[PDB]
Symmetry: D5
Subunit: 169 residues, 10 copies
Amino acid sequence: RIYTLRLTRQFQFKINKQTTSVGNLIFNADYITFALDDFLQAVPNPHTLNFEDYRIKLAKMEMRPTGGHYTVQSDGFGHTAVIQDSRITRFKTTADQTQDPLAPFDGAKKWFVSRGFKRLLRPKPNSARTGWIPLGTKVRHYGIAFSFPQPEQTITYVTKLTLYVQFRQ
Amino acid sequence: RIYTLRLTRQFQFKINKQTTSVGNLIFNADYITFALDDFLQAVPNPHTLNFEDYRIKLAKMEMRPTGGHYTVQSDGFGHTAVIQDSRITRFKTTADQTQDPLAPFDGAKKWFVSRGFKRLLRPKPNSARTGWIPLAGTKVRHYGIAFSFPQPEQTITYVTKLTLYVQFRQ
Amino acid sequence: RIYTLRLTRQFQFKINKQTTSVGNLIFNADYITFALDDFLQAVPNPHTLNFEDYRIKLAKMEMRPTGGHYTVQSDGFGHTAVIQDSRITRFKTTADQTQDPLAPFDGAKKWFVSRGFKRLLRPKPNSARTGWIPLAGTKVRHYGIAFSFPQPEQTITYVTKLTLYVQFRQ
Amino acid sequence: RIYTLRLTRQFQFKINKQTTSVGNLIFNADYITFALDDFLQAVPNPHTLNFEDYRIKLAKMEMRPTGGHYTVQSDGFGHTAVIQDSRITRFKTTADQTQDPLAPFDGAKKWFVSRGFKRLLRPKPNSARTGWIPLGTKVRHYGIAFSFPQPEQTITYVTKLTLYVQFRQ
Amino acid sequence: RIYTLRLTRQFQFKINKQTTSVGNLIFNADYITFALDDFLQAVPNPHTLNFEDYRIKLAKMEMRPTGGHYTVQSDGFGHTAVIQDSRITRFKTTADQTQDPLAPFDGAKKWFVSRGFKRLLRPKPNSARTGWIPLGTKVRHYGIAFSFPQPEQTITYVTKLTLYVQFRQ
Amino acid sequence: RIYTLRLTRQFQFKINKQTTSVGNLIFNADYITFALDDFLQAVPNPHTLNFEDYRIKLAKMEMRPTGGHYTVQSDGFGHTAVIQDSRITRFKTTADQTQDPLAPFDGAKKWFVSRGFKRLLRPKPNSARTGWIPLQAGTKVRHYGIAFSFPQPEQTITYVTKLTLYVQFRQ
Amino acid sequence: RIYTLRLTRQFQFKINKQTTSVGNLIFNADYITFALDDFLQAVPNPHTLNFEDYRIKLAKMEMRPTGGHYTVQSDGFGHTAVIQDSRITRFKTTADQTQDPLAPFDGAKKWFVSRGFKRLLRPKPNSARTGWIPLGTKVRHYGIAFSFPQPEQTITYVTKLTLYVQFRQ
Amino acid sequence: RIYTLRLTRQFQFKINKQTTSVGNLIFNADYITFALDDFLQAVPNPHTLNFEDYRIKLAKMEMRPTGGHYTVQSDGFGHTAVIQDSRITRFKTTADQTQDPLAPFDGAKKWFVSRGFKRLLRPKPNSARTGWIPLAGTKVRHYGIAFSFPQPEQTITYVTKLTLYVQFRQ
Amino acid sequence: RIYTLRLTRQFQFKINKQTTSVGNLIFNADYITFALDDFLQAVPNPHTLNFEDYRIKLAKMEMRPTGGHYTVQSDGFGHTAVIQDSRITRFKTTADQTQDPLAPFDGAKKWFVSRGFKRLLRPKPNSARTGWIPLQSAGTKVRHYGIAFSFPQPEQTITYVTKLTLYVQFR
Amino acid sequence: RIYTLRLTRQFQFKINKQTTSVGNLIFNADYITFALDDFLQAVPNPHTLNFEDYRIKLAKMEMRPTGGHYTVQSDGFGHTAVIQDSRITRFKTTADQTQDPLAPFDGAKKWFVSRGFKRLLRPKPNSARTGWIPLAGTKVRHYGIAFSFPQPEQTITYVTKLTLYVQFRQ
């Protein structure tokens, strides 16, 4: 018997207007990781239940523009990629690049800057094989990265993350 | 915090060939009710976990023909209806009916005998208002789905799967 | 304020196998009319409620094969037509015809004998203009839907469901 | 001002089982032409109205199997073709042919023998140019031909023809 | 025998421009409840009929922008949730929230601020079980709540509520 | 034998910017009726053809914005309703309403102000039962009818309206 | 044996802003005819081949806005109509019209001024019956007309015409 | 200037009932090639027109069952594959195979034996690059489409139509 | 740089007619596992190409009826389930079951006996985390799990053609 | 056995506002070619593997507006065309044209300036027939896709992504 718990949190994300080499195409990127404790603030504590292990079965990231940005105002496209190891940490690019850093990655999916994206993924921490983790709740799971060409104007987004967490006795 | 558990069970159902007033249209009906205990045989009891109460959020009934019955073989249509009280029990009538007993009911939906059906429902048992039942508690019966059918010229066997989507609260 | 009441009844219909001029195409037809009293067997008279008038806003006829007839077994096509006057009464044809009697009618819709049909219509009885009839009153005949068919090689039995959408006003 | 009249008639059509060269693929064909008088027998005549001319705007042929033939019982495919002159008459095939006689024709459309077909066409008779004809009603309009590979068993069809006729004063 | 009556009413709704913590993501929410007297006039009226009980079978809320707001103008997304008791009242928030108050709820559905939303629900008042209430018509039914991230500019909406009410003798 | 004639005419319609109770939600409405004479501007009387009766089988109203109005610019929604009697005439509202006057009506359909609408209807005038009206006065018989409501917008919106009549004549 | 040749040409078309009866609805219209020589400027001549006759089987007209016009900017709707004789010429009206001149015509199809339109047609010149013309190439074929309510601002379009021409030996 | 010509021809194809290792899964295959001369039997030669060269831009193969075979009668699935050189000839196949010979090939697409298939392809013969062939020239063989199938329990007859879309330029 | 190789093999599978508890509903099940060596007999070992590791990114199982079985002949439904450990091995049932053994499993998907099924999965063998396995071959024989499928026992025997597809990555 | 590799690169493309013959319709065009070395870097690299040959099975070009251009702001339509030899070079037009230079071409596909386009193609370099090239080598240029456009009233900037689907064999 597997019990499932859905958790969610939100935050703002900004893509800043291009200020260097204006008129040329440059890319940047960022990334998101997942830990059960990131989502256990407004929620009672699972350890008080007689569950032995938990597993992050599925995660969802949805980032959509706000601040009055026009969806019909084109700002190019970047990519999203599911990267399931610590290597993802290098994708909060400190320097601008001339090429999209995530387009070459396995399973890279295009997304349009002015419309945002929604993507499902299976983030990864016997645990190494199945993902079942003893209750622990701070174990980092990787992960989703997203790239973008730098736009002419700053764009603000609302990001919602959703965890689909499994528990077994 | 709401935890969700999916449970399922299956069984055979048979619509027997018409042997009475053959050549004329007659209807019968049957029904299904839901209790958490119906689904807790291969599964430990959730109260061994420190859950306070449970609620049957959703139920699904899918009944599909087997035994070699042809789906393209027309055997008319009956109806399904969600009936959320003990009154549903009156619907497996020992005697045949001349009219479809469920067609008049609120939310009745047609189904073709040779195809079967799939239907979702919210079966119902302060608990009387919310549906939360303390974790004998697992045996509270929830109602309910009835299904009617015109009697066919030949017997039809079905595979039925029931699914419970059960909520547990901390 | 308009209150709506949905009523339904079912019956068997049969298209008999062709026995005359076998091997040639012949057509027959039948028709259905609607009266509130046809549907009030299981319901008290709405006049016991303080309703003054009623109106048959909409009617639905669904006729689907049964008796094991194969839907993939081709038996040609006839037509359905909404006929809102006494002329419809001539369409329970006592004699066979060489042409489809309903195909020429305004709004005629093709239907395949082996599949049946479903059709909505607005049957017709200040009453003459609006359809509002004082609540005798429940027996006013409303017309109407006719359906034609080429005579098949073998007898086909159908289950017919009729639905009335009846309006009542305050 | 154009007034439109819809006329229809039906008849049985039969494709006989192959009795020659059994086991080999052969094709035959037939055709249909349209004249207003073909459809006016059960219809009060337009002659009684003060219309000057008529024109066959559109014609429809629908031929569907009957006699208990199974639609899932495959019997190959032939073609339909719109042929707008007297040449069509040669397509009531006297002799079996080794190739589909209509497949090469302009606008030929496949149809499956066990399903039948539905096809719209603009049959053709200043009248030669526009189609307007003085009220006359026996002018022949061409036309639709249909071919078929000869099946192993006889198949009977119900055929409905529909005329969409325009009238002007 | 069940007789059905459809009732409807409309009103304006405003999401005010963000004036606190400007530049940061904050959420607010509101809610709607349903009483038959919200929709009824003195004429015509079901009380004058001989019905014994009524039941709100279904309710519909549709809220759509007006005032010239651009639908292609992105303003993020909030959530709707069906809440079937008086607790819903705590979602008319006086204090702004850093997290979406309805996203965690069972059955929460995303909606985009600049688009509005349409949602069906079964609001709740043996009456507690079936919903049948003696005619009375002031009984309050719950309920639908909706959240939103505070936008940069005020947005005005047209809201239509619809009740599908059943009556029995 | 039924002969069908399709007729059409167009005109401009305007919803004026709200000038009363500005900032609050108010509704207005208007309506359209149909007479064969409305559409026979350029066609001889069908009676000169040997037709005896006519019947308005179907009518269509399509109203779409013009004047550069943005379809993506939201201006709320009103309703359309088919009203087949003289009661429709009261929907040329001289006074503003706080509620949508057509939303409660049987068959009311929502439409978005910034998009316009298209709707089919069967307008109504033995004639009372069937709709067949003698030709000769007959062509001026008014048929009812479609009404449409709207919340008053912040700015004036101009529309193009096309009406289409599907008229039957029998022998 | 029928050989087919596809030819295409483009040009600019303009609907000028309304200057007469400003504030009121007025209509205008224009039209397009087809001759093989209109399309043989950058293509070798077919008579160098041993083709006896040619026939314009199909024509396509596509007119789409340019010059930065917003497709979401409503400017009403007009109609297109296929008119297969020389009378089509009367539709380039020197005077504005109070009604849409093409809406009454058989087969008229609505088109929205701010989106443009695309339409297929069979333009018309034994030749009158079939359309086969001896190679001749200047024969005029009619034709497609399009009407429009006059807009508040000028709208520029790109028009592409395509001919599908048949040749037989 | 490019002129286009559509040509077509038909023939019967049969998949014989399994007679070897009956009860076990075995595969066979066949193939089709294209030459303009295959399609010019009822057509004059384009060189009588002053065309210099031709090119097969596109080819279509459609093979559909006949002889009364039931499309709902499951007989497994094989594959089709476009193979653009003479190696296509290697699927004779003189010996039955235990594996589907075309499933591994690039671009292989599944087809169900009881339904047949339709597929478009670009068959291939400066000419080696462009495909333009001077107008013996009409006999250049273009490759090609192969199709495999698991051997059925009963013989299945098909009608096959090939279509050529040939370009000619001045 | 990731290089992808698609490999496929086929075989026959049979569901035998019910001979125990005839007239009652019983279920059985079977399962499939994946090893690169199961698909690499015609192809030389990818280690002869200068590849160091391989990883089974994706696997597909498609099982469709043959032997003349009618797709319109109903024979109920079972389930498929992705099981990524040794537990799958117990699902070639030695005994008939009164309940569907795979219906309770995470991600179980219904399939109809008379139609067959098609399902994609990610079968599982730093290798334990990522799936990258060294080439040498012991590596190419590492068993990956896995897909199990259950079925109600039918009244007559049904034969299927099964095609397995491996999507293998090399770096 | 065929191993497949996906490669991608991006760059900015710009259609400049019209400055000549302002007010009249004129066309210009450009083109893209493909070489494996356009997409490769010094490490990792295919040469270090024991592959005999490679070939570009498929290429994809996607060009989409950026810089804040409104997709709903109409700027007409041009065409894309696959041109598989060096003649394509003549389509980076130095002089403005009154007619669309690619619209007459075989397989020309319309595209709207304000929306951009996505197109698949088979670019071309026994090698001339099949595309297989020995690992010249990775520098062989493959042709090719050209795209035309009516000159707009304002400058439009695009992001372009090219994708190569490369096959390798031992």
